[PDB]
Design a protein around this nucleic acid. Structure first.
Ligand SMILES: [Mg+2]
Ligand SMILES: [Mg+2]
Ligand SMILES: [Mg+2]
Ligand SMILES: [Mg+2]
Ligand SMILES: [Mg+2]
Ligand SMILES: [Mg+2]
Ligand SMILES: [Mg+2]
Ligand SMILES: [Mg+2]
Ligand SMILES: [Mg+2]
Ligand SMILES: [Mg+2]
Ligand SMILES: [Mg+2]
Ligand SMILES: [Mg+2]
Ligand SMILES: [Mg+2]
Ligand SMILES: [Mg+2]
Ligand SMILES: [Mg+2]
Ligand SMILES: [Mg+2]
Ligand SMILES: [Mg+2]
Ligand SMILES: [Mg+2]
Ligand SMILES: [Mg+2]
Ligand SMILES: [Mg+2]
Ligand SMILES: [Mg+2]
Ligand SMILES: [Mg+2]
Ligand SMILES: [Mg+2]
Ligand SMILES: [Mg+2]
Ligand SMILES: [Mg+2]
Ligand SMILES: [Mg+2]
Ligand SMILES: [Mg+2]
Ligand SMILES: [Mg+2]
Ligand SMILES: [Mg+2]
Ligand SMILES: [Mg+2]
Ligand SMILES: [Mg+2]
Ligand SMILES: [Mg+2]
Ligand SMILES: [Mg+2]
Ligand SMILES: [Mg+2]
Ligand SMILES: [Mg+2]
Ligand SMILES: [Mg+2]
Ligand SMILES: [Mg+2]
Ligand SMILES: [Mg+2]
Ligand SMILES: [Mg+2]
Ligand SMILES: [Mg+2]
Ligand SMILES: [Mg+2]
Ligand SMILES: [Zn+2]
Lengths: 69, 83, 97, 23, 116, 181
RNA sequence: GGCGACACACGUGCUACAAUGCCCACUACAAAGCGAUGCCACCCGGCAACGGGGAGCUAAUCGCAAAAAGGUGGGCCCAGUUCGGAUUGGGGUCUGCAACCCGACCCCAUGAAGCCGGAAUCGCUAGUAAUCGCGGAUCAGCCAUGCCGCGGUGAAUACG
RNA sequence: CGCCUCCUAAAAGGUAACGGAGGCGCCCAAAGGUCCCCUCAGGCGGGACGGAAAUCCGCCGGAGAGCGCAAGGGUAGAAGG
């Protein structure tokens, strides 16, 4: 590389919210991030976050069976 | 809307007509003047003709249209825009 | 904007527009015709055209009567013109003494 | 706020009660 | 982009700041700050990464939010419109949905005044 | 050369799995990363404030490498383009730096993307190369809210010695590129 | 079923655009009326609308009842905001044979326009205007922000 | 009405008509000298804002691009960048 135009890369630890620490390289030695691949829903199996719904609708109301036959 | 405590409302006289169709093995058009009626899980797959005030309107009933009333799918007002 | 009322009568968008056309005769005087109102009605002896209009210097209120609706609409306009012109020039009446 | 049901002041106005104005 | 996808206003009280997330009003605000034991009075610019991640962790996991909340509202309307119910119709014309009078007014649904 | 986790992962985990999966008869036939070419189409700096030294800075923080300028090949009316105008950046990452970039793209950047639902399965060149676009640079661990004047995205070309898409999906997937379908 | 339509236009009003203000809480002072399948204390369930219990009263007794602005304390700090509360999603409560068209209320979420309004134009001369709440008639419920009343605090200004 | 390019012009040069078509009366301090380096248009496929067309990646692509301006000749084994 040409001298004097490039930000030096040094060993660098990125600290995610799941409490993961990544040993990589950056122009900054230590980084805090809110999320990473280790804890991200799309990555992590299929963590169905807040909606483990099973839809739930629409047949599935069931309040109830009390109308006569 | 109509209280969770009280029943799910269908006019009785439509339900009988539905249930009779279930037994003998369906299916023909059911003329009705019951917009007040809930669509009900046993109604799914029919096509009921609902009155708007002038016309009895064909509504094929589907799985996704279940909690809604009968009149919701037979509109009461003709409107093609202004001018 | 301009509003027309047809009392106990059915009138066409044509007739409505014809009223706008006759009323525009008032734009001659070049002053703001504010929320002009035309009313059309059929009395026993002929039609009546009433109108009430506010301008920066006052109100025009007048009424036409004729066996013919179009003719009454016109007579309405005359009465309106005369009043409007009286509004616009009465102020000039006494610059001396 | 008199038009904001979600306040005390709203419910006095609408003449009603709830979480936001209790009796 | 702190919580959750949005960088909530610093300089603000956490109870208020959180309200600047799509899907979190006064209510859900007071609720999270209890379930994670933080003071509402604390300015966001004063939160421990600790206090922060507690907040973040809970909030993202208990309630549907931002893009996913919108998708559902879209999806809900999407279906209402396609099944052909009367509420679907009002959406299909951009008109009001809750029985309001449309002879006058109705301006928020309609947009500002359209010439004739 | 640097020991970087992803580089190692390639030699250790990915090389073999690939040879298994396609039965290569020569070590050089197995798919390699050639270059990652990052581009900023920009041109919001055409006349305006061609101080996109701010972006060149941002890009150089992300890659550890200073981009070079791109200028218009011809004059264009409707986009307002005098020929020779500075309208973009491009940084060609190779070797160790390419790996480091990807390492963090894969670990950290893509995760931070809004409503991320996986990379696009169909953005495959058809000669075994892959391309994907970002909307914002706040995705990278190095660029904080504090430092940015305005949201700008980028184009990422990842170039591979594989002859076919089918092989490239494999290499990129094994390495850890998350695909939606 | 409609009278509740909706490219548009006009009249009447409500709520605002904020710090003489907004929110939370603690705490005061009215009057006129209304009330037996009627008003409902108190106890319990629910964040709540409300539900279940259940005493009193033909009512100067008992109840609707809390008056609100106000006062004390706390937050907000000039931001389309802790302004504004429109629109919309979802979830409930009630009346009623029945709330698609088309009821009201509650709660979560949404959080519009609006930064004081061109031409023009309304009211009011004192307990008035402005602001603030409470009742009633109609009425199952209610689109009442309408109407008829009732008190609270309480100005400015009239050469002519 | 002078000058340039093509055709007429009969495969050397030349060759008329109030014959058929266009241009000049400038310009460039680099748009000049030299050394070094580089190669186009266009088609398909791929890529945030981004479109027929901005910039990026891939494959094809001998010159159809470029060469200040008309036309012609020339030209990437460069006269182009
Ligand atoms: Mg008269
Ligand atoms: Mg004046
Ligand atoms: Mg508010
Ligand atoms: Mg919010
Ligand atoms: Mg309506
Ligand atoms: Mg493909
Ligand atoms: Mg390749
Ligand atoms: Mg960042
Ligand atoms: Mg009516
Ligand atoms: Mg108006
Ligand atoms: Mg009103
Ligand atoms: Mg009463
Ligand atoms: Mg806003
Ligand atoms: Mg605005
Ligand atoms: Mg607000
Ligand atoms: Mg202001
Ligand atoms: Mg004013
Ligand atoms: Mg005011
Ligand atoms: Mg006004
Ligand atoms: Mg008087
Ligand atoms: Mg007020
Ligand atoms: Mg009242
Ligand atoms: Mg009533
Ligand atoms: Mg309504
Ligand atoms: Mg000459
Ligand atoms: Mg010749
Ligand atoms: Mg010749
Ligand atoms: Mg010759
Ligand atoms: Mg010859
Ligand atoms: Mg010779
Ligand atoms: Mg000649
Ligand atoms: Mg000439
Ligand atoms: Mg040069
Ligand atoms: Mg030269
Ligand atoms: Mg040179
Ligand atoms: Mg090309
Ligand atoms: Mg393309
Ligand atoms: Mg695109
Ligand atoms: Mg393109
Ligand atoms: Mg050429
Ligand atoms: Mg030329
Ligand atoms: Zn993580």
């Amino acid at each position: 590389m040409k001298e004097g135009i490039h930000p030096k890369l040094v060993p660098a630890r990125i600290i995610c919210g799941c409490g993961n620490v990544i040993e990589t390289y950056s122009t900054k030695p230590e980084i805090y991030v809110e999320v990473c691949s280790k804890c991200h829903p799309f990555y992590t199996g299929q963590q169905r976050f807040v909606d483990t719904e099973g839809r739930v609708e629409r047949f599935q109301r069931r309040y109830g069976d009390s109308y006569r036959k | 809307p109509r209280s969770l405590k009280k029943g799910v409302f269908v006019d009785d006289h439509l339900l009988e007509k539905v249930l009779e169709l279930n037994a003998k093995g369906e299916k023909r058009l059911i003329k009705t003047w019951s917009r007040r009626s809930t669509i009900v899980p046993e109604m799914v797959g029919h096509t009921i003709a609902v009155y708007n005030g002038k016309q009895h309107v064909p509504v094929y009933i589907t799985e996704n249209m279940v909690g809604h009333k009968l009149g919701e799918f037979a509109p009461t007002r003709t409107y093609r825009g202004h001018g | 904007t301009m509003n027309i009322t047809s009392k106990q009568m059915e009138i066409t968008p044509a007739i409505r527009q014809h009223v706008a056309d006759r009323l525009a005769k008032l734009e001659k005087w070049q002053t703001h015709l504010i929320n002009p109102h035309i009313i059309l009605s059929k009395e026993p002896q002929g039609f009546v055209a009433d109108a009430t209009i506010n301008t920066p210097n006052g109100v025009l209120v007048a009424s036409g009567k004729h066996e013919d609706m179009y003719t009454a609409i016109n007579e309405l306009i005359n009465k309106l013109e005369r009043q409007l012109n009286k509004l616009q020039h009465k102020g000039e009446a006494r610059r001396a003494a | 706020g008199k038009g904001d049901r979600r306040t005390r002041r709203g419910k006095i106005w609408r003449g009603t009660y709830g979480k936001y104005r209790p009796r | 982009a702190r919580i959750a996808g949005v960088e909530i206003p610093r300089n603000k009280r956490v109870d208020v700041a959180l309200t600047y997330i799509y899907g979190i009003g006064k209510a859900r605000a007071k609720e999270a700050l209890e379930k994670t034991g933080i003071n509402p009075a604390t300015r966001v610019k004063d939160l421990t990464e600790a206090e922060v991640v507690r907040l973040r962790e809970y909030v993202e996991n208990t309630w549907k939010l931002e893009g996913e909340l919108r998708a559902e509202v879209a999806a809900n309307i999407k279906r209402l419109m396609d099944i052909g119910c009367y509420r679907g119709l009002r959406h299909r014309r951009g008109l009001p949905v809750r029985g309001q009078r449309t002879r006058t007014n109705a301006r928020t649904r309609k947009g500002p005044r359209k010439t004739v | 050369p640097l020991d970087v986790a992803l580089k190692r992962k390639y030699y250790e985990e990915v090389r073999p799995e690939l040879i298994r999966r396609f039965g290569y008869q020569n070590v050089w036939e197995v798919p390699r990363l050639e270059k990652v070419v990052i581009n900023q189409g920009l041109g919001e700096a055409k006349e305006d404030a061609r101080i996109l030294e701010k972006a060149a800075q941002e890009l150089a923080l992300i890659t550890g490498q200073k981009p070079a300028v791109t200028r218009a090949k011809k004059s264009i009316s409707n986009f307002k383009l005098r020929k020779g105008m500075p309208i973009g950046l491009r940084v060609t990452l190779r070797r160790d730096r390419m790996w480091i970039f990807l390492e963090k793209l894969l670990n950290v950047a893509l995760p931070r993307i809004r409503d991320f639902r996986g990379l696009n399965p169909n953005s495959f060149d058809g000669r075994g190369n892959y391309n994907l676009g970002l909307r914002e640079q706040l995705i990278f661990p190095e660029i904080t809210y504090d430092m940015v004047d305005a949201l700008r995205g980028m184009d990422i070309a990842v170039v591979t010695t594989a002859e076919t898409d089918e092989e490239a999906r494999a290499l990129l997937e094994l390495l850890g590129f998350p695909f939606r379908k």
